[PDB]
Design a protein around this nucleic acid. Structure first.
Lengths: 194, 195, 195, 194
DNA sequence: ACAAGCAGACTGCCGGTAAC
DNA sequence: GTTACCGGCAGTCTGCTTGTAAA
């Protein structure tokens, strides 16, 4: 089909920019390198996508959805029994998933700069952020956590989690960093609950 | 008259202009021509004073970060805190005020980790806001107000929380309500962290 | 207009202009801005048709070298030679005519070995003047007018002697006398090389 | 004293530029690199020498006189007996000396383009060129070579020798190339001497 | 004799538009 | 789909000019 082929070149470009941008940063890979690696011409790319930024937008979407997939896998398998335990299992899950350098480059470093903080927020509300808003909402609902404004709490905890990830990855002894950071995140969480 | 002065003066104009412009529009979105022009200098003199665009951004980060600490310490002194715990609460409220500056949000919260790399900017913040967070925790532990725990991780995590808090307040649809509510969840967080 | 024609048209204008200017002043002494401006195109369109300055110089060389061969063959045909020896003599007299063109001396005798490398330019000349020399020698052997010997070495050596002959005539203070005398020693050299 | 100190940095600049330009070409080394290798600053370089060209001129001078030195050694050691045999030995001597890659880069390639063909000529008249003019003059003088204009002949034979050198250096089988080129030069010379 | 500040210029490259 | 093309940029060079010495 003619439009069925469009999706195939968009997948080749999205896969390639994800690999390359994930390896080195959005600024440090240009559209030529990316087109070459995808097996398409710069012209076709600028036909399927508005600009470099828009291709970064669809890369972000794909990556974030994978993060949610792998995370839910870990959270379901943890086997929590109360919303609070679900929150802790989510924390440990992100700690496992944020170990991926692709995720840190695309989501934690480049995305707020490419799409703008509000822009990436509009994207993350349909993913990790909004799932945090829901975990908080459920923990409030089941009486494990004081009623309070949810949007702020979720954003802040997301901040703590993101920076947790960078700290563990760049620390000189990563095993001890993951242990101690997990400890303090737990202590922080329990101090939040009842 | 002297060259020590001539260098320093050109660096002062270049850092001033790059701070203004980069802060208004982002590091990616302003080129060295525009920066030179606004500074009243030639691109050549700039590439003599600074290695590349990145090196100039590093000195802009430096000035901005110390400016952040100056303003914060000013606000904390006037509050009249008396114990590490009070210092922590007054610090949070202070950052909420200072981070109202969009130049601070653009340069420090967004670009710096991208331009310098995350560990690079960290090496910078340990000598400023990060290091102060480490001292506030460390003294709060000493004074028995906060349980002994690994200090560097806690400090980094709390910094992450405060940063995304400031971005949240700035970009909210009604910033007054967002500042009030965000202060709320930060306070509850602290109080649950302390005794 | 077609795309192959739009490319061919700008490539011809860049080659024409780079030929004019580089021939007037040397490859080192003319930049791609001047060259584009003279072609009436943007530096960007140029870096689309040509890899870099060097690649454009390579195509300029190619054009100039075939113009050299064309002018040479015209003059030699007009001599009315009939044997390989007569062809060799008429060739020398032709090179003396053609190398009067300073554009030829500038681009081929001076810049080309430095830009493309001695081996690189040789790879180019082997398909033009050098190859014509190798064939003129080869036929001179075939007809028994010249002693059997390694052909590539003789061809390269005679080329060196001819080139420096051209520079010599061009830069001498009385050029008319220089062409007469230089022609003399080349003729004697040739006759001593033949029988 | 200041003149003893001044002269020494020009020796270090000239040695450093000789090594470097000789390795990579005049176009491919900048004055910064050259200052660094000499152990001096660009300001000192531009105080002792007018421009990049001026340092190249003094490098040319040194190299050319070194060529004449080594050549004189081999020509003395061969032991010719008449001007003609002096010429033949001179050629084989150059063939040996031109084996040096520094000499081929600075004298045979860059110098005419940097200094201009006439400029380098004015330099070579006090060395290999002018000596060639003298060997021709003496060969005419002893009746071994026909009376003819000397300047043109000397320039031409210099051309044949120079290009001979590059051919031997760049050839795929350099041993066979030295044999064959020596051969064709011998035949040329003998056909010249009568 | 040396050093530093500085200015004009240049090369190769990129991102996005528009003509094929 | 594709190829030509434009405005603009970052980092480097070269030589000039103003400052700071070791004689």
């Amino acid at each position: 089909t003619q439009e069925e082929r469009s999706a195939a070149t968009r997948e080749a470009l999205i896969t390639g920019a994800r690999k390359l941008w994930g390896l080195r940063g959005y600024a440090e890979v240009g559209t030529p390198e990316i087109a070459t690696e995808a097996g398409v011409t710069r012209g076709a790319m600028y036909h399927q996508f508005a600009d470099k930024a828009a291709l970064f937008r669809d890369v972000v979407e794909v990556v974030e959805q994978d993060v949610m997939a792998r995370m839910a896998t870990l959270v379901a398998a943890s086997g929590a029994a109360t919303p609070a335990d679900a929150i802790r299992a989510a924390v440990d899950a992100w700690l496992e998933v944020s170990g991926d350098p692709e995720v840190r480059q695309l989501i934690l470093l480049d995305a707020p700069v490419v799409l703008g903080w509000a822009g990436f927020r509009d994207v993350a509300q349909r993913y990790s952020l909004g799932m945090t808003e829901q975990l908080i909402t459920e923990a409030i609902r089941a009486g494990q956590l004081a009623r309070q404004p949810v949007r702020p709490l979720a954003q802040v905890l997301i901040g703590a989690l993101d920076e947790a990830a960078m700290f563990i990855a760049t620390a000189d002894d990563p095993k001890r960093a993951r242990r101690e950071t997990r400890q303090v995140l737990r202590r922080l969480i329990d101090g939040m609950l009842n």
